[PDB]
């Protein structure tokens, strides 16, 4: 009766920036998924492929929990077949995604008078991300044809942009903490059942 | 990568810097305006200075990307707005000279004081001292003293500064490839590169003057009626055929004729609709006033106010020692932060102002999704026009009855409606010749058509001919009477009040047709008409991304400013005015003056 360490993910003091999104692998434990979906504490709880309704009657080989912070208006982008700054440059879900997306407003935690700039997102990139790809690079983005020499200037931009999270922002600009649950099924021991 | 694609990436970075840096400046500005402390002035200046420096920096970098190599118009609009040199096209000495001149004229206007004869210590400022006289005094000599002493002691200070201001502003404007500073101002209406919707700077002069010709018959009959009423009150001061003396017009300049209502009310036996007592009888507060305004916008399909609006706005006077600027203002701080600053009282006027200010918020929320530089009205007259029409609907007896404030046993009679249309005309119609003659005087001064030794001679020739107002004291070229008005000495363009006024009745007529209103236009209330809110919203969400000609067409179906809706609104008064003036002289001689 080994319980899956979900509190360490959902109740973490600080979440990761979306460009450097955390992944925690979940293995050899019992997961009570119904507690999360029947808690009435999240603003978004959407599952693709699997059903949130009492499908903690299934076994999975490994479960991955991806967590990060984005603004409220960018929460649509955490979904299959979406475009935008987050979906193309920071966190990309596959078309055949099988899992759940969980989000809740965290204005009380990630906002600060004068602005909380702890959270970043990637604003420029040469190409879009593959599904479940992470890019933490800080290479100066070369918008023009003149090399940047590792410093920002004309047509040379630092690729990461910070959120300015203030408690007085509108809901669309307020911080939201997101947890993405991936349910992997391999030809393998299937160690995460969770009655 | 092409120049265009570099520009898109540059604007991508600018928009993201600009949210946060504008937001910090707006938030620092808010804290001072609601809580006046020395520390808050400092923080407001620090945040404002960094935003100004960032804009400077970004304008120079925007000039790297040639507009000639950009095809995407919505990209080109954003670069052009950011690229504008402004005063930064002059040498560094000349821009400093201009900024010093602007600050001195502003300081003279706001600190200028007049002391009465025989007591050099009992002195008055324009606000509230001299404004109180010009709006409430019936004494001819007291009004004359305030009118003359303001211009002779403050206006004469502004005359040498305004001359240098004309020279330097024309220098920036010709360096920015405009004919002159007036041509620069008219660029706010310019549209290029949009087949079917283009508009030239010189076209604005033609359209303003064409629409003003159709306004003349209504204004002449307003002017004749006002002159006849004032002549009864001041028989030895007013000629039956002459111009109205400039100091007997209800404020310092005759900009509005609002305060002439008591002496010109047609039926002074029927009281006004003043719903203030009903509001107090029902224990209304400021929150109730703003919920009622919110329900008005919700009734036409517009969204309710955000949660942050209720939590962050200041809808009442803070009171005890925390002190605030009480001028009603609607704030768009960015990042979805919308607020209203207003020291609301439980009165009918503040009830109407709340609908007016929340109309601004509805405009702001509608284009919030636009790029940063395109978050504004279609042109300088759009935003205020949207606010005005909200108070038009909210003030009608039909609307006041539906919200339980006006008694159901109150029915409109034609006498109260003539009274209402008069007071509307005194404010709305009366300012149009004033607004037009002033901006044309400035246009001619900037163009070089008025020599310096004829500035005041031509100013009062155009007052007599166009406005039908005559100065009570002869003024030589040591005077600078136009600069005695805020907008002239503080470097603000003025035609926006002419265009806005025509826009608001074009808007109201179109929305009321969408609401299927029956009867005179002035009795319309657009409440409960999702068809009317939708046709308004189709323009509001555009912001500045489309030509103002197209944005106007979304509401009214026409591509240009039109005066007919304004005349349609006032036709019942116009018919009544023509019948009143049948045994009166209509028009004015320009040679008569009170100083003979
Ligand atoms: C987070 O903490 C709350 C309160 O301590 C608890 O109810 C909740 O179950 C925790 N989250 C998880 C995933 O266990
Ligand atoms: C007003 O400003 C001062 C600092 O200038 C601050 O300490 C105080 O809390 C403010 N009061 C309110 C009511 O915001
Ligand atoms: C201009 O660019 C924006 C974004 O870069 C794009 O959405 C729009 O379709 C473009 N317009 C034209 C006419 O190419
Ligand atoms: C605004 O209306 C929405 C429904 O569209 C509602 O969910 C929300 O609570 C309302 N907010 C306020 C402040 O009335
Ligand atoms: Zn306004």
Residue numbers in the entry:
A (entry chain B): 333 to 527
B (entry chain A): 19 to 614
Give verbatim lines from the article.
Given that residues at positions 417, 453, 486, and 501 are involved in the interactions between the RBD and human ACE2 (hACE2), it is important to understand the detailed binding of these novel variant RBDs to hACE2. To further elucidate the molecular mechanism underlying the binding of these SARS-CoV-2 variant RBDs to hACE2, we prepared for RBD-hACE2 complexes and obtained five crystal structures, namely Alpha RBD-hACE2, Beta RBD-hACE2, Gamma RBD-hACE2, Mink-Y453F RBD-hACE2, and Mink-F486L RBD-hACE2 at a resolution of 2.9 Å, 2.6 Å, 2.8 Å, 2.4 Å, and 2.7 Å, respectively. Each complex structure was comprised of one copy of the RBD-hACE2 molecule in one asymmetric unit.
In Denmark, a SARS-CoV-2 variant referred to as the “Cluster 5” variant, and designated as Mink-Y453F in this study, was identified in farmed minks and subsequently found to be transmissible between minks and humans. In the Mink-Y453F RBD-hACE2 structure, the carbonyl group of hACE2 D30 forms a hydrogen bond with Nδ1 in hACE2 H34, leading to the Cδ2 from H34 forming a hydrophobic interaction with the phenyl group of RBD F453. Thus, when compared with the hydrophilic hydroxyphenyl group of WT RBD Y453, the phenyl group at this residue (F453) shifts toward hACE2 H34 by 0.4 Å. In addition, the molecular dynamics (MD) simulations and molecular mechanics/Poisson-Boltzmann surface area (MM/PBSA) evaluations revealed that the binding energy of Mink-Y453F RBD-hACE2 was significantly more favorable than WT RBD-hACE2, and F453 showed better binding energy than Y453 (ΔΔEBinding = −1.03 kcal·mol−1), with the major contribution from the desolvation term. In addition, several adjacent residues were also shown to make favorable energy contributions to this binding when compared to the WT RBD-hACE2 complex, including residues R403 and K417 in the RBD, and D30 in the hACE2.
